[PDB]
């Protein structure tokens, strides 16, 4: 026999190990691979697909209504419409999105984000709104003047129903932790900032038209986005054997 | 990252015995992100 | 009939420096989600960017990297020195939720078995005993007792190991009669029956059962067994909407209705 | 022309030594495992003495006593070489030598009329054991030229399914179609040669699977006759005559 | 010694493993391979050989009589003669055939099937019968009209005593399970359909001839047939040590 | 004198598209089972077919794939610290029935031995003990006791292992004096004797016995042993009609007569 | 299925020690399915 | 370390086994083979007497 | 029988460590069976 010396690790079962092992059916011949549409090779292909943000996560909103950002004819100027932390992996409106689910399967992320909004009022309903991304350092902007100093887009309601605000990757480090859990890890360190929306002018409508309307909010990863360190999704759990 | 040099010899008869695949690339996501018939260029308006 | 190409990449996209743009021609920001297409507005078109040679890889999100690790699929204790486990991955939710992220998938699997002896009060024992795990395909006779003739296993594959040895481990090929396993099936298990219990399950996903025993009788103690499964050489099709409600049953995707996924906050204007 | 049109002619003539057998209602000819009898190769042989090859004296057709297809007929069988161990020079060469090797040409005969119906399975089984009894009787394992009647046809006297005996060289005598079956058999064994008085390499069975019936008043006495010819034989280990 | 790390699976005895091991007699020289007729290299060579189906498996039929399909002079038209599920591995008439035995040694099968029938009446007995294969979806056909809509052959009794009905492989998947066990696995999913036989005209005979006759039924795998996943044949068992 | 050729194939036959046929010439469907030949009617001749490039393999039904796995052949407990097992595969029916599917066969074998200590009540013990398995060929002296001189095993091959080590395993060549093992023998074991007990057994199939002992005396306990055998490099001749009745004896194929194989149904016209 | 590349070196003296054969093909079954002297073509009648 | 998987038979003592093993005296140099009549290489040489 | 191909590399310093010899042939036995000075041909008488 060839002299050998076995080492530490011998006999261990590392779940992420990658060895060759005997097959239960050494001569088995599988069915042929047939042509099936929609092959996916990497989940980055999935997170780049836009999905709805559960943005109106308030007590008065149930089910489907939680996807609608409320808009209404104003009687004052420069008012706020919505606010949200841009972090894709933290608890909140982003957690149930495609991007959020996969981000929650990992410990770190990087990349620009695509936030697209679609106005759903009548053809006659007009309006201009400003959507801003505030890089970290302080709290969310308190008014439109402060918000507009950051990255932003001014959206004009019209034939092209939607607008995209790209939240560019602006970070000290190449990656950020996906959680901002503070008590233990002090990960608030990684906060990516905020996205806020304000009336640029006002929502305006003809006589007897609905004075309230909705905006749907979409989010997806950009082509420079990636994830690292797989981890179990915190949303999936069980307390006992399943029926 | 991954080694540019490493041993990859199969000791078993069936491919099912082999270690994990080592490709790991991604592909353009258009079949999922933009499954449309008409091209809508980034610089133009989507509908006319 | 594939009109959309899928070129491969080993790194995420670079950022190229861009300058200002004041025109009526190019309007990258204007979009229309109604088309079903995700926005194509690029970073460089929305703000002035700098050059960034981005060498970030994409490996850890590949199907192989995401699925290529072991997860618990079975856990039980023998009774009368034997236990019959029907091979299915709906009992333990973690691996189950992962698989349901794809509609169809082909893959080989590496099964790892960890076993030890426990007493009547479920206290682990330092006791080395030989155990046998036999794969019984559908149609083959399942042993009723710890010493039935089927354990001869002349055709059924069996793996005999010891609680004193490292965990047992064997690879299995892509065994379905279909050309891919299905993790979502909108149909019934048979013709001539439309009962609810026969809905949403594709029989070809069930390859049989694993029957476990100790080769000889334990005295008052039992064999505790955990079975782990690791997908290998994964090929997948048609990504699915992720599970967003707790699982309730092992064989069905039944769930409890809900009015919200994420928790509520005071107001939409306060992040 | 049978060859040109791709079919098998219903007439046949089998000529070996001083014997010629003919039939006008055959159903092709079976050659067991697609192999004609062959001599023992120098590379397979082990017994070193020059063998005796009797030629035409033993390689000819021997007709055994006929058997009646009675109303309760379950079938009949003959062991080979046992059945011919005391017939002509084949029998003598078999008795005077310790070792024997050889093939066969079997012709089973059973004619009735276009007014009769019935179907016989004619099968040549290698190593066919008569093991339905805890202690098989010599009278049944080696019935001689008279052969023996089947007692357990459904289980083929060996615990297997009669219907699967088709895995062995066989033909059928289906009265509406043919009145004879012909099978050429090569020597089969796990040895180059063996004792003709201790081992029967093949067993010929003629089993009724569809009972004999006929228009009322037709001839009721219908015999079954077996004619067998040793082919390509050789013997080693000469001594005095010895029978089992 | 060369540094090594032993892995999970070490020491295990997988019955289907395939390693090289020391020989008890390292210098042993076996007897030569001699010329023996009938070499078989694959059992597909065996299942392609026709064997009798125990088709008349009813209380009144014992032993050899179970292989005979009863036929008789009719006094009505379009009547049925027999029926059978075509599945080669399920309990029933097929289980004792060569094809059935080997199919029962496996978990999956694929391929067309050869069902051949031989008429055994007198030379003067005539008749025409239709044999049909009904692909799955419903129950066995209730009458000849329904049966003839499927794959079928019309057989004319004559000099050529037999006819072949090929049950072509028509399946959603490339393979089918060999059992249709439902309570546990719901394998009824795989049912391959039915084969039924009916009088096309009638069995006709001269004066005083037997008014009943028999048909023998043969079955075998076609050249596109294969089996996968070996398993113990359920028919072979024991309750204790053998005498 | 081989008139029928046997070309090899690695996949099943393809299906080629076919069209209708209305003629008096070609009649593929007409057959004649009396000839002894299986029908030669092809799929393409009986119905209109499509093209099917069939890549289904034939590997798992090869003799090597069918026989190439371990099956139980012996199981016993020592008495007085010793046990004598006559090498034969008629005790346990599963492997036995497989072998009887062939008339003649040559093959090497891999023997695997699994042993453990059990007490008087047949309860398994966690006790490591050295055991010896000695192959005693016919004609060699068989030890009468656990400490007899034959255990010196200077010529007889022996394998010494421990219940605390993995199962013992050794390969054996094709050892018969014949040119193939016989799984069906229509003859007697000797000249000058025609007793039923000497019928149907070919002595050359018996290569001796395995005698087992613990190297030193166990105190009140016994050694439980299981012997598995795996055929390798199989060459076979003359397929046989499968066993269709239960086995009753270890050395003979005696059986109980039966009037049916499959169970009955109400009528031949109801599937 | 089976690997197109895998190690196959024998470590032992006797062939009996070698791992299982890796051929596994099948052969034309005619010696069992059609062991007849006269060819009976598929398109013709069997007997005349 | 090179990943390995030990198999059945490990640790067993087959009397007819044939492995290489460490020598008690690795540098030992035996006496020369001298010319001695009657060398036998196979016992078939003896049974033919 | 013996493999026509198998590994034969020595891992140890001293030849005593090597596995068994793999020759196993036999030689003409005349030195034992016919150790005589005068040749006595098979076809002739031994003594004259
Ligand atoms: C003797 C060795 C034992 C090892 C275990 C062998 C298990 C064989 C079965 C392999 C099938 C796995 C795929 C099942 C995937 C579908 C799961 C589901 O839908 O619930
Ligand atoms: C010392 C190592 C022990 C290992 C066991 C060695 C066994 C040697 C005997 C090999 C013969 C096997 C072939 C027997 C096949 C015939 C069986 C039967 O007909 O019942
Ligand atoms: N306490 C019980 C039940 C424990 C149990 O079933 N736990 C489940 C979750 S509810 C599990 O997934 N356990 C993982 C493990 O123990 O490996 C026991 O130990 O028998
Ligand atoms: N209960 C008895 C008899 C058990 C027995 O002999 N079982 C037979 C079948 S009847 C067998 O094949 N057992 C397989 C095994 O235990 O590995 C014992 O354990 O001693
Ligand atoms: K790049
Ligand atoms: K645009
Ligand atoms: K985008
Ligand atoms: K001569
Ligand atoms: K092919
Ligand atoms: K034809
Ligand atoms: K056929």
PDB file of N, CA, C and O in Angstrom, chain A residues 183-206:
ATOM      1  N   UNK A 183     -28.185  45.761  16.874  1.00  0.00           N
ATOM      2  CA  UNK A 183     -27.900  45.276  18.222  1.00  0.00           C
ATOM      3  C   UNK A 183     -26.684  44.362  18.337  1.00  0.00           C
ATOM      4  O   UNK A 183     -25.865  44.527  19.242  1.00  0.00           O
ATOM      5  N   UNK A 184     -26.549  43.413  17.418  1.00  0.00           N
ATOM      6  CA  UNK A 184     -25.428  42.482  17.465  1.00  0.00           C
ATOM      7  C   UNK A 184     -24.225  42.826  16.583  1.00  0.00           C
ATOM      8  O   UNK A 184     -23.102  42.955  17.074  1.00  0.00           O
ATOM      9  N   UNK A 185     -24.467  42.988  15.287  1.00  0.00           N
ATOM     10  CA  UNK A 185     -23.404  43.256  14.320  1.00  0.00           C
ATOM     11  C   UNK A 185     -23.089  44.711  13.970  1.00  0.00           C
ATOM     12  O   UNK A 185     -22.075  44.986  13.325  1.00  0.00           O
ATOM     13  N   UNK A 186     -23.951  45.633  14.381  1.00  0.00           N
ATOM     14  CA  UNK A 186     -23.746  47.051  14.089  1.00  0.00           C
ATOM     15  C   UNK A 186     -23.732  47.300  12.580  1.00  0.00           C
ATOM     16  O   UNK A 186     -23.031  48.190  12.094  1.00  0.00           O
ATOM     17  N   UNK A 187     -24.518  46.520  11.846  1.00  0.00           N
ATOM     18  CA  UNK A 187     -24.577  46.649  10.395  1.00  0.00           C
ATOM     19  C   UNK A 187     -25.278  47.897   9.861  1.00  0.00           C
ATOM     20  O   UNK A 187     -25.354  48.090   8.649  1.00  0.00           O
ATOM     21  N   UNK A 188     -25.785  48.750  10.750  1.00  0.00           N
ATOM     22  CA  UNK A 188     -26.422  49.989  10.301  1.00  0.00           C
ATOM     23  C   UNK A 188     -25.347  50.750   9.515  1.00  0.00           C
ATOM     24  O   UNK A 188     -25.631  51.669   8.752  1.00  0.00           O
ATOM     25  N   UNK A 189     -24.103  50.332   9.732  1.00  0.00           N
ATOM     26  CA  UNK A 189     -22.914  50.864   9.068  1.00  0.00           C
ATOM     27  C   UNK A 189     -23.123  50.909   7.549  1.00  0.00           C
ATOM     28  O   UNK A 189     -22.703  51.851   6.873  1.00  0.00           O
ATOM     29  N   UNK A 190     -23.792  49.884   7.032  1.00  0.00           N
ATOM     30  CA  UNK A 190     -24.040  49.730   5.600  1.00  0.00           C
ATOM     31  C   UNK A 190     -25.239  50.445   4.968  1.00  0.00           C
ATOM     32  O   UNK A 190     -25.415  50.349   3.753  1.00  0.00           O
ATOM     33  N   UNK A 191     -26.064  51.142   5.749  1.00  0.00           N
ATOM     34  CA  UNK A 191     -27.251  51.783   5.170  1.00  0.00           C
ATOM     35  C   UNK A 191     -26.962  52.473   3.839  1.00  0.00           C
ATOM     36  O   UNK A 191     -26.061  53.305   3.733  1.00  0.00           O
ATOM     37  N   UNK A 192     -27.742  52.110   2.822  1.00  0.00           N
ATOM     38  CA  UNK A 192     -27.557  52.632   1.471  1.00  0.00           C
ATOM     39  C   UNK A 192     -28.240  53.955   1.146  1.00  0.00           C
ATOM     40  O   UNK A 192     -28.032  54.511   0.067  1.00  0.00           O
ATOM     41  N   UNK A 193     -29.055  54.466   2.060  1.00  0.00           N
ATOM     42  CA  UNK A 193     -29.709  55.733   1.793  1.00  0.00           C
ATOM     43  C   UNK A 193     -31.208  55.640   1.610  1.00  0.00           C
ATOM     44  O   UNK A 193     -31.824  54.624   1.935  1.00  0.00           O
ATOM     45  N   UNK A 194     -31.796  56.698   1.060  1.00  0.00           N
ATOM     46  CA  UNK A 194     -33.241  56.737   0.885  1.00  0.00           C
ATOM     47  C   UNK A 194     -33.715  57.184  -0.479  1.00  0.00           C
ATOM     48  O   UNK A 194     -33.009  57.869  -1.218  1.00  0.00           O
ATOM     49  N   UNK A 195     -34.942  56.792  -0.789  1.00  0.00           N
ATOM     50  CA  UNK A 195     -35.587  57.208  -2.015  1.00  0.00           C
ATOM     51  C   UNK A 195     -36.859  57.902  -1.522  1.00  0.00           C
ATOM     52  O   UNK A 195     -37.583  57.366  -0.680  1.00  0.00           O
ATOM     53  N   UNK A 196     -37.089  59.126  -1.990  1.00  0.00           N
ATOM     54  CA  UNK A 196     -38.277  59.880  -1.600  1.00  0.00           C
ATOM     55  C   UNK A 196     -38.925  60.456  -2.848  1.00  0.00           C
ATOM     56  O   UNK A 196     -38.256  60.679  -3.857  1.00  0.00           O
ATOM     57  N   UNK A 197     -40.231  60.689  -2.776  1.00  0.00           N
ATOM     58  CA  UNK A 197     -40.978  61.229  -3.904  1.00  0.00           C
ATOM     59  C   UNK A 197     -41.772  62.437  -3.428  1.00  0.00           C
ATOM     60  O   UNK A 197     -42.345  62.415  -2.337  1.00  0.00           O
ATOM     61  N   UNK A 198     -41.808  63.483  -4.250  1.00  0.00           N
ATOM     62  CA  UNK A 198     -42.510  64.718  -3.909  1.00  0.00           C
ATOM     63  C   UNK A 198     -43.260  65.285  -5.107  1.00  0.00           C
ATOM     64  O   UNK A 198     -42.941  64.978  -6.254  1.00  0.00           O
ATOM     65  N   UNK A 199     -44.261  66.114  -4.840  1.00  0.00           N
ATOM     66  CA  UNK A 199     -44.989  66.761  -5.921  1.00  0.00           C
ATOM     67  C   UNK A 199     -44.031  67.819  -6.464  1.00  0.00           C
ATOM     68  O   UNK A 199     -43.470  68.596  -5.690  1.00  0.00           O
ATOM     69  N   UNK A 200     -43.814  67.828  -7.778  1.00  0.00           N
ATOM     70  CA  UNK A 200     -42.940  68.827  -8.395  1.00  0.00           C
ATOM     71  C   UNK A 200     -43.856  70.020  -8.682  1.00  0.00           C
ATOM     72  O   UNK A 200     -43.489  71.176  -8.463  1.00  0.00           O
ATOM     73  N   UNK A 201     -45.053  69.724  -9.181  1.00  0.00           N
ATOM     74  CA  UNK A 201     -46.068  70.747  -9.419  1.00  0.00           C
ATOM     75  C   UNK A 201     -47.287  70.269  -8.629  1.00  0.00           C
ATOM     76  O   UNK A 201     -47.359  70.475  -7.419  1.00  0.00           O
ATOM     77  N   UNK A 202     -48.222  69.606  -9.301  1.00  0.00           N
ATOM     78  CA  UNK A 202     -49.419  69.088  -8.643  1.00  0.00           C
ATOM     79  C   UNK A 202     -50.117  68.097  -9.570  1.00  0.00           C
ATOM     80  O   UNK A 202     -49.844  68.067 -10.770  1.00  0.00           O
ATOM     81  N   UNK A 203     -50.982  67.260  -9.005  1.00  0.00           N
ATOM     82  CA  UNK A 203     -51.761  66.332  -9.814  1.00  0.00           C
ATOM     83  C   UNK A 203     -52.958  67.203 -10.183  1.00  0.00           C
ATOM     84  O   UNK A 203     -53.585  67.789  -9.304  1.00  0.00           O
ATOM     85  N   UNK A 204     -53.264  67.304 -11.472  1.00  0.00           N
ATOM     86  CA  UNK A 204     -54.367  68.152 -11.920  1.00  0.00           C
ATOM     87  C   UNK A 204     -55.372  67.357 -12.748  1.00  0.00           C
ATOM     88  O   UNK A 204     -54.985  66.568 -13.611  1.00  0.00           O
ATOM     89  N   UNK A 205     -56.661  67.568 -12.488  1.00  0.00           N
ATOM     90  CA  UNK A 205     -57.705  66.846 -13.211  1.00  0.00           C
ATOM     91  C   UNK A 205     -58.853  67.735 -13.688  1.00  0.00           C
ATOM     92  O   UNK A 205     -59.039  68.851 -13.199  1.00  0.00           O
ATOM     93  N   UNK A 206     -59.629  67.249 -14.670  1.00  0.00           N
ATOM     94  CA  UNK A 206     -60.773  67.989 -15.218  1.00  0.00           C
ATOM     95  C   UNK A 206     -61.938  67.920 -14.227  1.00  0.00           C
ATOM     96  O   UNK A 206     -61.833  67.278 -13.178  1.00  0.00           O
TER      97      UNK A 206
END
